[PDB]
Design a protein around this ligand. Structure first.
Ligand SMILES: [Ca+2]
Ligand SMILES: [Ca+2]
Ligand SMILES: [Ca+2]
Ligand SMILES: [Ca+2]
Ligand SMILES: [Ca+2]
Lengths: 376, 376, 376, 376, 376
């Protein structure tokens, strides 16, 4: 993930132009190889035309170039690119929104599962670890970076996400499917056992715990669904062929012809086709947006930091359920204990951000005395 | 379903160009016959024009071709196709999202329904089987593959999805409607009976079970609604007529005219309309996307794997509710039992994915000593 | 509602072409009268120009055609139609999604409301009938077909949806508003009475029932809102004028002038404007899609089957709450009682749909021995 | 709000054409003044050009007209208008969807708040009046019509929405913010008091009441947010500048030049620029749609009927919570008491709407005996 | 945040025209510097071409001028700008919708947390302060104005949002991540303590409180996600490159060539490219919309008022949980105590807004005696 929120916080002079001096996750980094290939082919064709071709062959090549330049518009690359990229971006944000965060579940577990002793600590840690194990299983099934980190269940055991007993259990229940769903059944059964054993005081608390776990399960199922059901290959091929055919046509239709013939478009000859290169950047970068966002769990610069998410979730959930359980800061009267209208101060750099309350768009409407009189 | 997520994980050089080589569920497989027909018609017209027509006929044909060429417009067809395809793709993804997964309900059943004895086993299995039976009924109503697998309720009984007693009850209840709703009423009544018999210990747990079952029922109802209420036939015919009128006009407007006549745009006389064929590929593939995705439960290569979904749901739900009930791995302290900040290790292949935590976009904002001072 | 899902299940050769031979709910059926009027006007203008203009007249009619045919492009017909029809289709699907289905509420009632005696039967039937009565009241307020079926509350009483006592109570409560909301208050009060009388065993069950009933009420309110708040009249008029002015201009801009004049494009008199007719079909059908879907509760072929929905809902809900209450099939061990991995059989027609489970896109990633080794 | 649903129920001949004869909430009513100003400017410029200008001044004006006519483009304005109007319409429908309806809360209050005596009547009426008071406060904050009806809290007291005691309490609680949130705190505290006093029999019922009240609070907050956070003024100015620059250019670029000059675009002047006026109609009406819908709580014809909504909500909620409390129609067996399959009759006007049930798209598939046999 | 809802309440004459006289948050304020730079470059190029080039160089520049003009298109730029700006606007509205408001939680806390003594006051205030502290932590993480107001946790303690004990606890819990999640765990633990101590009378009320707190936590997590996962830098660079390349080509393509050369479209030599400047305004403002809305928490005119939101939330929540707890206005019969149909009066200004109730679109349908007769 490449973040430039701090850079684009305000709409300053050349705000988006300053972002053109970036390399990581940039259009240059994404399409420099394709641009080099296109440049090589373009200049190879140019040299072939100027040198190898005879006079009649050159005349035929010039007619071909004029014809290709005239027929290029008949490729609606922009229409298809816009629609396809919109679809890809929507799927990308949905896939992010389906990333499971254990914060709500961990707060519920810390609040509800009682016991400051070893048994209570173990129960809370086991529940949060089941949640994290399910999340990590789905993530390693759907993300190449997570898979490289944990290429096997033995790797998961060594990393601490799974105990040897849990690994042995997963083996006994093994079925010819992805077993990311097992930790949720484990969580349900362990929560029921805790409620029956008095560690969870009420069925409403148990139900809340299971509701949070089920929300996480739905998120993981959505991640699996996005991984499995790819965007239609036919649609992807349609967009790809459009872009590639456009630029393959440009390779012959944007060659500078010998000025001796003085064709309307080719009176002046400069070696570099600057506007063809600009079109290449525009269209191929538009395509690269989809090429990078189609699988947001790869190893691209703008792909999600799944490994960091996993590490942070483990740390935060374990800390919340173990060290933060029934461990609260001292409860004392606050700064505004007897202040009817608290007014937190402003710093010098923030004093200009003090605004009056907005009371509604009708607040400033002016009416006469007779206008406001109720009628019988 | 055709999956290429592995292939498109990273935005490598020519990633979509590599996908262009796939055959299954591809644009070539979808439109080769239509392309053959279009090519045959185009070249029949060409041969007629250049072999049979007299001089006057040829002059009239050239005038008509020049007249036709101006009519062809890309904007209207592009708009109609883009909107129709966007609607079709949105409906296709919604239809997938309405596929019922019994994971949440099965975890709830495994947790809440008590009893390791034969009666408890039977109760849990019957509940999960009612859920799966409703799912399979709707799926065989809406999916041709599932229907071919289970062409009759007797086939459902033979496959083990429905018992002879359940089949008899369904026949007794038969109404002139799709009876896919009966298993949900059965599930509600059986859950109420289990709660009254002490197998379910709390009405809160009963309510959670019924909420999950009702979510499944709503998903099945959405599947039925998508199967029943097709996209407006008028809209489908409008898009089809747009595409066919465009290409029928092309069949003449794109004919190469005798270059001797020195017509404005017909200098070069190639035998193949390369750009017209590229337009055919793009637009007919865009239409084929909607043709394939309009009914995602058919037998297309890109259609859903309803049979696999049914089998996996049955196996997973039965295992969870029967073998996984109150069967948990030993609860023991984990690797980070007394590690305040656990740090799971990284492998050699994943060490490059270790990232520092993102602490916010305002983190790096610099302020002076005076700027950070509160004012009264 | 015209269903062609079975026909468009697979993307076959001419899949959408075969849909052009349909009559009910078709473009021809929708716009044949408009096309006939346009054709009559066009051929009246042709005859007027060819046999009523002296010559200077003919010369000015030519000049008017060579002007209308050129400024015709000024109309943003495609943009307007696309953007308006997208909104119309979205509203149409939302209106369908707000159709109340009593399946969840009826399962909840059948389960929760206890008593196999006459009083229990009456209570369950009365609750489900209140739900159905509210649904039918809103449907007859918003749908012309349902109103024609039940043009009065006396008709509702004669049809069995409302009791004479309920009709008298409605007349007693009558306010100068649509009284479709009364059955929901009746349902809430009857459920409270049933809980107080011991027929409902728990406030949690009562809350679940009221949640389902309130979801139904929200759906009915959304139906009322869609009926009341029509799409902006200015927005509809803009698109209507855009289409009508375009096709009124075409009447004089797409005429075949005298070939003697040798006007460019006007040299050949084909009599029949094939492309003008194709454009008429395309655009007027794009507009007819919105015309038909703007009120999905009218009497068009593609409008919702509100009467069938009412009948099916009544029958299904009554059966579920009366005949199916505490009436379950015998609970016996299933076919896979002791089968760890059940595998339902495949028929000959479906054997090709047996697929290997998808284990994730990272499943086939290959790594070296050192790549998978954890580092310190 | 202008309603034409009954008029557009069926897609009849000229269904949308018949709507061009309406005045209220019409494009004519919205843009007639702008059209008159534009016409005056156009015919001032035309008369200056053919009268005041000298012989070479006319040539310069013709050159300017051609130069301007070249730069009049449809796609940029069309695209910006489409996107902006789509956003405006989405916000308009969301703002309607956030209008609070007290129906669910009133049904819950009537059911749960027990007691047919004076204390119970007062409690139920006070709760429903708190809900209505919050709704009215937000409505008078966000709607000009509601503000004009109730320009002060004293007006609210006189109208009966607030008691003098509630007005005094609001004055005591006065903060420098909009105080529409106070009635929700009042409702929560009164509900807790009622539960503690035995009037509400269960904390589950209390929770349901508070959930409905909080849903209403969220709707009111969304209304406040839409009132406060307007669409970006930059975006509005961009769209306005696009439209106005277009039609300011059209003032000179669409003048009828001298036909004798034989200019390509001007061989026949019609005095009245019919197509220019049609473009003005289309684009200015498209912009006026957004102008009217940007604030749907104004006083336009198509703006929401907030005053009627307030009146109806008050009347319906008070009736439901006071007169309909534990007042049910006599519970008696219905018409289909012992009818296994009820079939309500059809009138002569609706007999054609009787339909056979839809059993699924796979119902009609035909399979051979060998094809339907399960394989080992 | 710039509000003009009161200005655009009604669609009046020049409604959006009067919005062009605004400076704050205006297109002029956003793009004046860029327009100045573009103008300076354009006139530098013009002066060079007109006073420094020789005859042959001027001829070459003239040819390059038409070459550049031929290499300019509007369709792709409009398409990409429209889709990118739509995405940015959707994200902007989502980011606003994820701003946490403590209204529902504060009402629940005031209702449920019992006790008018100091312990109860302290408990309620501490819970509401935990919610506000979490909100403020996320806000200072994601918003530059809030960060400048509270550049440190010491600043938060000095402003009263955090106590010294809470600050010490946060330091003790410090992890290498954003610690904005700690207050939710604190809230859950304090709520559990309050329920166990009898301050919360029921686990149902506890569950409601925790559900509201978890909704706030989800909103804060969405704010963090929007701050962290920026829109793809490739997409941003693509849009920026499109716009900037378009105008870079325009710099030379829109130069006014020497009129003496009588080029196709350069007869006039207006010194100011009025239409090029209008296009600059249009497109650069369309881009500046996205530039301003990409980070809605900066310090732009149209950016959210996070500081005011924080202050208002603190004041309102503290008042609601402390002073408004069990402090209700006297419950007395209302104005319509025994009026079956209350009719609040209308003022002279709003008398015209009194409307008859909408009874549905089928209300005015007319039927015959035979038509409305039920059939056998
Ligand atoms: Ca990727
Ligand atoms: Ca299909
Ligand atoms: Ca209709
Ligand atoms: Ca308005
Ligand atoms: Ca900003």
């Amino acid at each position: 993930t490449i973040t430039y929120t701090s850079q684009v916080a305000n709409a300053r002079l050349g705000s988006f132009s300053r972002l053109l001096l970036c390399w990581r996750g940039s259009i240059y980094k994404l399409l420099y190889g394709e641009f080099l290939i296109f440049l090589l082919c373009y200049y190879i064709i140019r040299f072939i035309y100027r040198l190898a071709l005879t006079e009649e062959q050159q005349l035929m090549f010039e007619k071909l170039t004029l014809y290709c330049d005239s027929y290029i518009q008949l490729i609606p690359i922009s229409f298809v690119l816009g629609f396809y990229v919109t679809l890809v971006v929507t799927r990308w944000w949905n896939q992010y929104e389906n990333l499971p965060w254990p914060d709500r579940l961990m707060s519920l577990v810390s609040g509800f599962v009682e016991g400051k002793d070893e048994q209570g600590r173990l129960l809370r840690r086991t529940l949060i670890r089941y949640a994290n194990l399910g999340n990590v299983l789905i993530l390693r099934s759907v993300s190449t970076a997570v898979y490289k980190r944990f290429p096997s269940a033995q790797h998961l055991v060594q990393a601490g996400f799974m105990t040897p007993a849990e690994h042995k259990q997963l083996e006994k229940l093994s079925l010819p499917h992805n077993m990311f769903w097992v930790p949720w059944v484990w969580f349900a059964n362990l929560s029921m056992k805790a409620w029956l054993g008095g560690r969870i005081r009420d069925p409403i608390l148990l139900q809340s715990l299971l509701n949070e776990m089920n929300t996480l399960r739905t998120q993981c199922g959505h991640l699996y669904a996005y991984d499995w059901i790819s965007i239609p290959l036919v649609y992807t091929q349609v967009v790809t062929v459009a872009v590639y055919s456009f630029f393959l046509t440009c390779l012959v239709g944007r060659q500078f012809l010998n000025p001796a013939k003085a064709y309307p478009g080719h009176e002046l000859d400069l070696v570099v086709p600057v506007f063809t290169f600009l079109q290449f950047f525009f269209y191929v970068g538009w395509l690269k947006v989809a090429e990078q966002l189609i699988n947001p769990f790869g190893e691209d610069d703008d792909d999600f930091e799944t490994n960091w998410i996993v590490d942070r979730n483990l740390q935060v959930s374990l800390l919340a359920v173990d060290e933060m359980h029934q461990d609260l800061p001292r409860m004392e009267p606050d700064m505004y204990w007897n202040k009817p209208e608290p007014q937190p101060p402003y710093t010098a750099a923030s004093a200009q951000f003090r605004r009056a309350s907005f009371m509604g768009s009708t607040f400033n409407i002016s009416l006469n005395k007779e206008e406001m009189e109720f009628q019988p």
